[PDB]
Structure 1
């Protein structure tokens, strides 16, 4: 046929305007997905990077669980295991300065040499070294050891010689498995069988998870690789992970702050550094993200209260943050021995269970402390301080959540409170979750409506906000106000004020539902 023009001119031809649709605009936000983020010390992982762990592949990413014999190192992995039973998450690994990774350098002839370098430092190539290969994963080549083999290959039209690199893993007993196989060429312009580019640094950065390579530009032209079998990486050791400086924790927190991925909750994976907890609370307040924190279980009942005040969270600046204390002990599943845990992740599990009760709205109504939401399933619990009882009123004043014995003999979280000094309905965790969800949805929807003529954007904002509020009311989030004489029966009241010519204000008022914490009954005779 022929082209169809648009916005016809002054005569003759006809035109069809582009398709116009604006009342159909909508914003797609899950509002039910819950994800957790945290930092910790793990046996295997890439230092100071955000790593995504799921229910299936978390063990491979984080490596083998740490032995309980070592001090203050088994807590993060087991907290991650407890918290990951519901949803996936993001972790940041912290490493001491003493740790290092191995590097294998190749000469012009092909004679290999071995060295070890710290994680932060960048490698340097001296004269006579064609290139170097190091491990990006950071797992030390102890116990299961990684070995590299080189084989020759055929050319491809242009005569660019290529070779096969094979990385294998060998256990202590002698079991050998093939991990990776790749075809790489020293020539800058090389092609694979399927047409993929064949350059060792580019190929490793594109389709490899373990190895990276750096090639000295001086010796790229004159370099030859011969047949070498079973090249083993030299000794790479991990420093004492029991002692971690505050600077490393701060750097890990800063790295976690700048993460493109979205996470719904922030968890303290066995971190007892006050500065790190304050930074995590600042991140939670900045991102309007719920946060859970744990006081050191080693402290007694009397010493628990000053510990909360020691952390810089007791104030009105951090509202969504919550804290817990758990001084009991249990048994590890992997190793049959006594262990002490921190009550972090169980609260996240309760929150996830409460969220999953609804599909579209999100189901953020339920507090993370209930008869069925929180159960704390563990092998066996032995109290560490018998013949001693806590003070309930002191804990309420200090904003601490305690534990009790359930009807079926299972330990249970009997209260949910946040780190808010005032009693202005904010110490409860039920309301900030709803408010944060509403604010996030409003920000996401308003971001799309930027730079619009007046009137159209008013209708769009009103329609979207009314739909969201109606959905929340239908889900049961909002209840009629407790004062019907002074306040209208409408659960929510929304108003839009243009005010300034370019600025524009929106106000919404909601009545959160009630939480049954104390029940009192009296008998009367008639």
Structure 2
């Protein structure tokens, strides 16, 4: 045996880092069965843009979870972590107005100048300044310090001058790590050792995920750069993130609305603003999609019911939107600190588990509630308001869902109701879900056959619908009518009515599968 190094350099060897007394190892996996969406507040991230996060990116993208001691800023990341165990999704970040990002400007001689600007604003280069480098990622450099290093390199083959740009990260303790390195040339027409372009803005846009640059075209030609030691970004900060105005929330919701990624669920990740919830419900009803929302968990049983009516969801417009209430407490995963947060992303997990059962059409008839699909996996549960009992009938009248302890011992979601006051077989969760899935399939069918020599025709619209309805019958979503004498044995009836030549009409009826939720036993004695 021989010596063992602690860190790897450029030599060929095997290194072992010192033993770490405390650390956590996490393993992830990727799956794209169903796509969710939402809004929230996080540590770092490009604000007001759609971000795609998987199980292996939700730490790099987004950021390190915020400490619960800050208050009201930790819920969204916990909801995202709970929901991401099934499939990936999309997130839009909302940031307060008093938020700035750092930037360093360079003089013709090469000295740096530090400043910060609001996220909305655009960089304007003062006369006498050659170029500026700023941070594209919405990451303030307060607790982790980011330093920039410049040194010279060999000149280009065609006589152009190039230099090395390096980025480093330093913690509060003093541990220094290396993030990125680049070869950059100020000349417009320059090439890398690998043949790629070395123009600073183009290279930074292409092969860097942290930095961007803006140059002044007039004075770029007669510019000189000298070697500089580590220079740290300053002035980049995030305002108080516990106080977010409704305007930012509405802007994030509007950003979600105009997205082409075609997700299949919308989630309220710890957002307890009524206007934002109503906007999210409007988005949910627009796209023929399911939706899950949550009321504030700290409210008692008595105050929870009016809080459901406070949001505008309760009515006939917003069908297939569910509201949950969870006044319990649990130990946080990252730090065992006894945090409280609601149930959003646990219901979606149950729905995704139900959907994964069928592979042809998805099997949307499975209800989210149940002791098998829906389980709450948390460390230790302690009721916030013991010796208190909810009024179950009032909750049912109020379209509020409840939770209960299962046979195994873990907490279970025991009901699934949508926000529809009328008695239309629609307050059951799956009944709108089947019809929404069929409607989406029909829309995709009708979009495709428009590009046909004839176009949209009544004869063409019947064959495809018969095929799709037969597939849905095969999956078990549609069943024959209960009374065979009064109604026919067919599960669905598809017919076309003529009327006049100009006006046609295509209609199909369906008999949805039932759910078993109330059971009664009657003992007797011989």
TM-score, normalised by the number of residues in structure 1: 0.90
> Is the contact between residue 330 and residue 379 of structure 1 (CA under 8 Å) also seen in structure 2?
yes
Gaps of 5+ in 2: none
Report how many residues are paired: 526
- Offset of 1:332 from its aligned partner? 0.7
**Root mean square deviation of aligned Cα:** 14.2
> Is the contact between residue 46 and residue 136 of structure 1 (CA under 8 Å) also seen in structure 2?
yes
- Residue of structure 2 in register with 1:120 after alignment: 120
Q: For residues 292 and 500 of structure 1, do their structure 2 counterparts lie closer, same or farther at Cα, with a shift above 3 Å needed?
A: farther
> Is the contact between residue 290 and residue 321 of structure 2 (CA under 8 Å) also seen in structure 1?
yes
- Offset of 1:513 from its aligned partner? 0.3
Q: SS of the residue aligned with 1:474?
A: helix
Supply the distance in 1 between the matched residues of 2:327 and 2:26 (Cα, whole angstroms). Answer: 49
- Offset of 1:2 from its aligned partner? 72
Q: For residues 80 and 166 of structure 1, do their structure 2 counterparts lie closer, same or farther at Cα, with a shift above 3 Å needed?
A: same
- Offset of 1:195 from its aligned partner? 3.1
Supply the distance in 2 between the matched residues of 1:172 and 1:3 (Cα, whole angstroms). Answer: 31
Q: For residues 499 and 409 of structure 1, do their structure 2 counterparts lie closer, same or farther at Cα, with a shift above 3 Å needed?
A: same
Supply the distance in 2 between the matched residues of 1:514 and 1:354 (Cα, whole angstroms). Answer: 15
Supply the distance in 2 between the matched residues of 1:362 and 1:16 (Cα, whole angstroms). Answer: 47
Q: SS of the residue aligned with 1:62?
A: coil
Q: For residues 21 and 104 of structure 1, do their structure 2 counterparts lie closer, same or farther at Cα, with a shift above 3 Å needed?
A: closer
CA deviations 1:249-298 (Å, max 9, x no partner) are 00011111112222111110000100000000000000111100000011
Supply the distance in 2 between the matched residues of 1:89 and 1:300 (Cα, whole angstroms). Answer: 32
Supply the distance in 1 between the matched residues of 2:298 and 2:214 (Cα, whole angstroms). Answer: 47
Q: For residues 370 and 139 of structure 1, do their structure 2 counterparts lie closer, same or farther at Cα, with a shift above 3 Å needed?
A: same
- Residue of structure 1 in register with 2:323 after alignment: 323
> Is the contact between residue 46 and residue 138 of structure 1 (CA under 8 Å) also seen in structure 2?
yes
Q: For residues 455 and 198 of structure 1, do their structure 2 counterparts lie closer, same or farther at Cα, with a shift above 3 Å needed?
A: closer
- Offset of 1:40 from its aligned partner? 0.5
Supply the distance in 2 between the matched residues of 1:7 and 1:293 (Cα, whole angstroms). Answer: 48
Question: Larger deviation: 500-509 or 437-446?
Answer: 500-509
Question: Larger deviation: 232-241 or 193-202?
Answer: 193-202
- Offset of 1:172 from its aligned partner? 2.2
Q: SS of the residue aligned with 2:505?
A: strand
Q: For residues 166 and 342 of structure 1, do their structure 2 counterparts lie closer, same or farther at Cα, with a shift above 3 Å needed?
A: same
Q: SS of the residue aligned with 1:59?
A: coil
CA deviations 1:164-184 (Å, max 9, x no partner) are 211111222322222111222
Q: SS of the residue aligned with 1:426?
A: coil
- Offset of 1:46 from its aligned partner? 1.0
CA deviations 1:51-103 (Å, max 9, x no partner) are 11111121111111111111101111111111111111111111111221110
Q: For residues 492 and 224 of structure 1, do their structure 2 counterparts lie closer, same or farther at Cα, with a shift above 3 Å needed?
A: same
Q: For residues 306 and 17 of structure 1, do their structure 2 counterparts lie closer, same or farther at Cα, with a shift above 3 Å needed?
A: closer
Supply the distance in 2 between the matched residues of 1:31 and 1:309 (Cα, whole angstroms). Answer: 37
Supply the distance in 2 between the matched residues of 1:455 and 1:8 (Cα, whole angstroms). Answer: 65
Counterparts in 2 of 1:61-72, with a 5 A limit? 61-72=61-72
> Is the contact between residue 31 and residue 361 of structure 1 (CA under 8 Å) also seen in structure 2?
no
> Is the contact between residue 31 and residue 87 of structure 2 (CA under 8 Å) also seen in structure 1?
no
Q: SS of the residue aligned with 2:125?
A: coil
Q: SS of the residue aligned with 2:149?
A: strand
TM-score, normalised by the number of residues in structure 2: 0.90
Supply the distance in 1 between the matched residues of 2:336 and 2:27 (Cα, whole angstroms). Answer: 51
Supply the distance in 1 between the matched residues of 2:360 and 2:10 (Cα, whole angstroms). Answer: 52
Q: For residues 16 and 505 of structure 1, do their structure 2 counterparts lie closer, same or farther at Cα, with a shift above 3 Å needed?
A: farther
Q: For residues 22 and 221 of structure 1, do their structure 2 counterparts lie closer, same or farther at Cα, with a shift above 3 Å needed?
A: closer
Supply the distance in 1 between the matched residues of 2:400 and 2:225 (Cα, whole angstroms). Answer: 65
> Is the contact between residue 325 and residue 402 of structure 2 (CA under 8 Å) also seen in structure 1?
yes
- Offset of 1:409 from its aligned partner? 2.0
Q: For residues 137 and 8 of structure 1, do their structure 2 counterparts lie closer, same or farther at Cα, with a shift above 3 Å needed?
A: closer
Supply the distance in 2 between the matched residues of 1:107 and 1:10 (Cα, whole angstroms). Answer: 34
Q: SS of the residue aligned with 2:409?
A: coil
Supply the distance in 1 between the matched residues of 2:18 and 2:91 (Cα, whole angstroms). Answer: 47
Supply the distance in 2 between the matched residues of 1:72 and 1:467 (Cα, whole angstroms). Answer: 50
Q: For residues 337 and 21 of structure 1, do their structure 2 counterparts lie closer, same or farther at Cα, with a shift above 3 Å needed?
A: closer
Q: SS of the residue aligned with 1:90?
A: strand
> Is the contact between residue 27 and residue 445 of structure 1 (CA under 8 Å) also seen in structure 2?
no
Q: For residues 9 and 229 of structure 1, do their structure 2 counterparts lie closer, same or farther at Cα, with a shift above 3 Å needed?
A: closer
> Is the contact between residue 146 and residue 168 of structure 1 (CA under 8 Å) also seen in structure 2?
yes
Q: For residues 3 and 431 of structure 1, do their structure 2 counterparts lie closer, same or farther at Cα, with a shift above 3 Å needed?
A: farther
Q: For residues 329 and 203 of structure 1, do their structure 2 counterparts lie closer, same or farther at Cα, with a shift above 3 Å needed?
A: same
Supply the distance in 2 between the matched residues of 1:375 and 1:500 (Cα, whole angstroms). Answer: 55
- Offset of 1:4 from its aligned partner? 71
Q: SS of the residue aligned with 1:525?
A: coil
CA deviations 1:155-212 (Å, max 9, x no partner) are 4343332222111112223222221112222222232233323221122222211111
- Offset of 1:423 from its aligned partner? 1.1
> Is the contact between residue 116 and residue 234 of structure 1 (CA under 8 Å) also seen in structure 2?
yes
Q: For residues 345 and 12 of structure 1, do their structure 2 counterparts lie closer, same or farther at Cα, with a shift above 3 Å needed?
A: closer
> Is the contact between residue 162 and residue 183 of structure 1 (CA under 8 Å) also seen in structure 2?
yes
CA deviations 1:219-266 (Å, max 9, x no partner) are 122112121121211132211011000000000111111122221111
Supply the distance in 2 between the matched residues of 1:467 and 1:292 (Cα, whole angstroms). Answer: 31
Question: Larger deviation: 366-375 or 219-228?
Answer: 219-228
Supply the distance in 1 between the matched residues of 2:27 and 2:282 (Cα, whole angstroms). Answer: 28
Q: For residues 107 and 251 of structure 1, do their structure 2 counterparts lie closer, same or farther at Cα, with a shift above 3 Å needed?
A: same
- Offset of 1:17 from its aligned partner? 69
1:451 aligns with 2:458: no
- Offset of 1:327 from its aligned partner? 0.7
Question: Larger deviation: 177-186 or 298-307?
Answer: 177-186
Q: SS of the residue aligned with 1:456?
A: coil
Supply the distance in 1 between the matched residues of 2:518 and 2:154 (Cα, whole angstroms). Answer: 79
Counterparts in 2 of 1:53-452, with a 5 A limit? 53-450=53-450, 452=452
